[PDB]
UniProtKB/Swiss-Prot annotation, chain A:
Protein's name in the database: Nucleolar protein 58
Localization of this protein: Nucleus, Nucleolus
Organism: Saccharomyces cerevisiae (strain ATCC 204508 / S288c)
Miscellaneous comment in the UniProt entry for this protein: Present with 34700 molecules/cell in log phase SD medium.
Domain Nop per the UniProt entry, residue ranges: 1-96
Family: Belongs to the NOP5/NOP56 family.
Lineage: Eukaryota, Fungi, Dikarya, Ascomycota, Saccharomycotina
From Swiss-Prot, chain D:
Residues of the full protein shown: 283 to 470 of 939
Provenance organism: Saccharomyces cerevisiae (strain ATCC 204508 / S288c)
Free-text function comment from the UniProt entry: Involved in nucleolar processing of pre-18S ribosomal RNA and ribosome assembly.
Subcellular compartments: Nucleus, Nucleolus
Protein name: U3 small nucleolar RNA-associated protein 21
Signal peptide: none
Curated annotation (Swiss-Prot), chain E:
Subunit description: Interacts with snoRNA U3. Interacts with MPP10. Component of the ribosomal small subunit (SSU) processome composed of at least 40 protein subunits and snoRNA U3. In the absence of snoRNA3, forms a complex with other t-UTPs. This complex can associate with pre-18S ribosomal RNAs.
Misc. comment: Present with 18200 molecules/cell in log phase SD medium.
Organism taxonomic ancestry: Eukaryota, Fungi, Dikarya, Ascomycota, Saccharomycotina
Location within or outside the cell: Nucleus, Nucleolus; Mitochondrion
Modified residues (N-acetylserine): 1
Function, as annotated: Involved in nucleolar processing of pre-18S ribosomal RNA. Required for optimal pre-ribosomal RNA transcription by RNA polymerase I together with a subset of U3 proteins required for transcription (t-UTPs). Involved in ribosome biosynthesis.
Originating gene: UTP10
Record's protein name: U3 small nucleolar RNA-associated protein 10
Covered range of the whole protein: 2 to 432 of 1769
Family, per entry: Belongs to the HEATR1/UTP10 family.
Curated annotation (Swiss-Prot), chain F:
Organism field: Saccharomyces cerevisiae (strain ATCC 204508 / S288c)
Disordered as annotated region, ranges: 19-50
Lineage of producing organism: Eukaryota, Fungi, Dikarya, Ascomycota, Saccharomycotina
Localization per record: Nucleus, Nucleolus
Record-level GO BP terms: endonucleolytic cleavage in 5'-ETS of tricistronic rRNA transcript (SSU-rRNA, 5.8S rRNA, LSU-rRNA); endonucleolytic cleavage in ITS1 to separate SSU-rRNA from 5.8S rRNA and LSU-rRNA from tricistronic rRNA transcript (SSU-rRNA, 5.8S rRNA, LSU-rRNA); endonucleolytic cleavage to generate mature 5'-end of SSU-rRNA from (SSU-rRNA, 5.8S rRNA, LSU-rRNA); maturation of SSU-rRNA; rRNA processing; translation
Name of the molecule in the record: U3 small nucleolar RNA-associated protein 11
Amino acid sequence: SLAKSPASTIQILGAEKALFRALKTKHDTPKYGLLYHASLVGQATGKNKGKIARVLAAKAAVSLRYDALAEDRDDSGDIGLESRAKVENRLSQLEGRDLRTT
Amino acid sequence: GRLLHTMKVDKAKKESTLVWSVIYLPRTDQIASGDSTGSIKFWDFQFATLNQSFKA
Amino acid sequence: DESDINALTKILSTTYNYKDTLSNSKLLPPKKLDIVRLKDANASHPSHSAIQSLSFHPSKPLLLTGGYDKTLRIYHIDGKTNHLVTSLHLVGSPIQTCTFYTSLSNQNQQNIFTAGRRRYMHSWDLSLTAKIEKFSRLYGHESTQRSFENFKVAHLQNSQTNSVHGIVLLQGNNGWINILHSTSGLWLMGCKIEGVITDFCIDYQPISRGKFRTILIAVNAYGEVWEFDLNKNGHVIRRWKDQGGVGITKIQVGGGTTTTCPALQISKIKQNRWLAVGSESGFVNLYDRNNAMTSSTPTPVAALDQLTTTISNLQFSPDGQILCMASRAVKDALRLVHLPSCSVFSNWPTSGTPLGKVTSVAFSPSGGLLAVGNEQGKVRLWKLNHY
Amino acid sequence: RIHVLKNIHRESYGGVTQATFLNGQPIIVTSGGDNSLKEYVFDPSLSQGSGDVVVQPPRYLRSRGGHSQPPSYIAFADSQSHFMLSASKDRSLWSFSLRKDAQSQEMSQRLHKKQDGGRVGGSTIKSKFPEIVALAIENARIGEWENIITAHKDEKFARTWDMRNKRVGRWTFDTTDDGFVKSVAMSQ
Amino acid sequence: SSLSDQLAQVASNNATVALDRKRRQKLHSASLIYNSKTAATQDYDFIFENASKALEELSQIEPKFAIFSRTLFSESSISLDRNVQTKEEIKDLDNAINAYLLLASSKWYLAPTLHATEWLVRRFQIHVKNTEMLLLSTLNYYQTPVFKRILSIIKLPPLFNCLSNFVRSEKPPTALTMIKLFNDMDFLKLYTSYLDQCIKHNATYTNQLLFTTCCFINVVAFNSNNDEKLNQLVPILLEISAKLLASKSKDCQIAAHTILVVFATALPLKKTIILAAMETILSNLDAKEAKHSALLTICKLFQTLKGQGNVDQLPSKIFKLFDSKFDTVSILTFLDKEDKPVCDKFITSYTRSIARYDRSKLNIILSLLKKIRLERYEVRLIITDLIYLSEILEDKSQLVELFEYFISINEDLVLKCLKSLGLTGELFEIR
Amino acid sequence: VKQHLQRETQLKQVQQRMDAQRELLKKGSKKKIVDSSGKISFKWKKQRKR
Amino acid sequence: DEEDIALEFINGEKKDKLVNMNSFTSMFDNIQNVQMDTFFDRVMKVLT
Amino acid sequence: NPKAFPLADAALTQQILDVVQQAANLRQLKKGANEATKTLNRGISEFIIMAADCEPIEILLHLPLLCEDKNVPYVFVPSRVALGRACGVSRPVIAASITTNDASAIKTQIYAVKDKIETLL
């Protein structure tokens, strides 16, 4: 039941009371959810932590529906590891930018 | 059981066309087919495509 | 201090340019062109419609332009004054495609083949009144050819004698390519593909002294590409599928002799190295046919994506180093990609080159010279200074 | 090898014929056969501790110049016999000063923007105008709008110039019979 | 220039002299170890004694610091005040401080050197007077705190303007900031002068060369599409590549290999610059790792080479020197490697050099072109040099079997080249 | 439950109109298609997103 | 045949990779304590 | 790919990609696995196109599990690259849901293709 949910739902999976009050009055919804305490979102600083909570929720939906929906799964961490390498180099490339001018 | 190829005979102008008869010729690698236009076409089986048509 | 392993120190001390200069280059640099602009080719006599078809002569310095104002104009081109040689107005027959053709038999035929959405084709015999013939007989196959619009001209050998002649290949309705003789108009053969035929091209490949083989390459809309050998009867030899590819508007080979860079002697016929499949999306798959003439699901060597609306022209440079992609849908949609590297040139066209709505394009076979004609009827001429 | 100033003086009139460091100064006076005398100065280094290995390249200091080719047209620009416009076959239009040679100045050719918002065509790498055949100046409305009207060799339109700002003006004047400009005038 | 501008000039002249107690506190609170409120109240003997202890730890780690114990960290240099001696003694002690900083550039990960250079900061004011050497020596450690500390206290030079928004900020300077810093030309001349000092003192190391090489190939990557900037950038980076190739350190030599290969694939240099580059590559090759990188470098430097004469024979002197550094066994073990790096033009020039200059060993050239696949123009020029060899000397078993390989693969091409120059029957009668 | 059906189809229509307006104000070329009666529509240019 | 040998020289060329503005920007995260020859091979994997 | 049930033949996938193209012009498809699942959970899908080419195909085959819950037609096409091109984006697209509109222009095409999808179920 986690595997058949979209990745935006997996992003905001914890923050339902903030989500649904910010939807029933037309405010701005939360962005982190239960995925805030993941190690990569802890590594990110600023509003690109909301950015990489989005990309981490996308990749976690990929790895998790592959987990729950595979049959010949090898218990080796290959899909999670290539997705985590993708998230790591994404996070590195949007921490390397800086909005100050040099 | 899944259909590998779909070949299309030369349709008529003022009526719908139906492929009435189809046979296979094993010395060549062909399919003879007579349709409702009257034409008789010789389809190569591998590559599934026409070799010659006759408006017989 | 000092009065007169140090090799690099001493050579950097002595030279001032650190590149190869002029004649020791022989092939293009990537990502930067060297391209100037000459006078507009029809700046002498203006066109009265869009320029649907544009073709250089194989030997003479002549350019043929033609559009829906049913007249076709020949321009002796140079940089200075592109002057109008002559001009023929075929009434009621609005030409879509016109092509200079010269034979391998004598190089003294010089026909001009023109066609548009009519049930006939014209062959103007050039010898400088005009002597034109009108091919209107499909010899029994008139049901499967309702217009002559998409035609191409190619060479073909008899192959019981070693006698070449010219064929014109019309694209028909169902999947048909109706191939017919060029001097006599007789129907020679017909190659049917499955689906909806959209474009085709002609690959030549040599065999021996004075013998070649002509292969028709006909694309579907879905991307699945037939190849019919036609110097025997029009029989299929390879049927592969373009990777990706959903609406395929254009297919074009290059690097050898195609219909746009023809060869004049029967020993100068080469194998077209690159194929390119241009789609309705703007994606151009580029295949290198030195290895991918086997696999029947080949991979492209690069899928170019730079222009975003429907590919309606793509032609290879006659030396086979530049591909010109062009879309007749939006203004200034032309790109020159540099192959083998498949990296689009970045310094031309810039935002102020007057391409317009590019609706036809032709490279000249000798001078390295682009001619691009747009919807408002203006062939602009550029000279690629590398050649 | 520190730097190389390329095309400092025209090769066709001799190249650089003399260059010399004014001694004890970082300035160098060069002069060519192209009727030009330039000076170039070496600024102090940008590196505050090394200095001698980070040598900043030579930049341009003052310079006097004239025509490189003998002039084709001549006009007196004002009634005080102070300035004269003079246009040569190296396709430059200078305003020479009779009262002091250090007021001579080449009238610039940097174009304005077009009035509507269309792009201005022409080449991208810039060159001078074709060489001037005629010119006509009536400085009654000087500083208000364009003042000189000039006629170039083998082109079908006149140009305007502004003598107060010393530049070209916003207008070119076409003949509208497809024929080269043979004569200009302007009302008083 | 205005009066405030001339007074700004005399202020930046008199920046380190303490004219009153408030300037002395502003000036002496600039520490590398302590905060302001403790740094302002430490004396000189305190920071000298713990910096001499820390120099003793650093000197037992690395034994070259005993001379700085003799001069820069002696007891008389507590009272040695920097801006009361002349221009001559100033230049003597600031090349001494340069000697310290390029010696201890490699030690910055270990806290004895922070405590050891805190006394040069607080006694001789090297955060403001010798500041470019401090920035250049510790430029490798931008991410780590040490660089955060010198950017906290430093007065930034004009060439280091791109770091000007990272002083006193909680994020270290980023990688694109380091690339935008190195993208100058005046900074690049400054940095190559610094690398010349580091090489001439043999104080280069692995992390410094990694940072230098990464930023140099990133500069060429950034300048890749401005050919005017690349033509500006040739005689600085290839000259520092020559000064890196002319030393003994294998890591600086393969650093110069990396610089050369990225530069050659960025813009096509001259044939004579590529030939002199490979001669300077071969002229000081010592280890195995340097040899492996040098062979991959020579392969790519000859592959990125277009024109009439790309596959001509590499000359007599460079041929003897190349076989001196890499024998034919080494080339065959190189071509047997299953990764298959692209070496077509180099191996074509190699066998043309063999058949022009060796004239004894042809079985090896049969073996290596059995190993790698060459192109049609390459093998056409190869068999034309072999045909000229068979004309100039009598054709024994080696040359004959070379021709049997070339008629077993593509007999039509050796037919066409004999049709260009010779006859089939005449070469059968010479055979 | 009949009333819940009415409210759900009414909310479906208003989200459909609101989302059509939202797609309409994004970017890309588009023409105001008018149908027979007057129920206007928008057809977008055949051009892919870069 | 000289035009034919020129066509075979400009035909016998392979697709070689070019340096972009943003090809070597991912080396800064792993220049840390790796060796210089491993770094050289890391560069060569990008260049080929 | 063996776990790609109903996979379309060439003529069916030709008309499926054509109805995808003109739905994308009319701004009537949602392109992506997450967006397709959102259209399913809101129940505004006409049908689902999936690509039997995603290299973990288990990033797809969970929306079949909730098309069997929501009795909506689904089909597989051979190539994600071709699906991205037909959708009119510059990226390979794994699944695409054609949303429901009743006043649409291509309602008849949508119905004909979804009938020819659910004939092979």
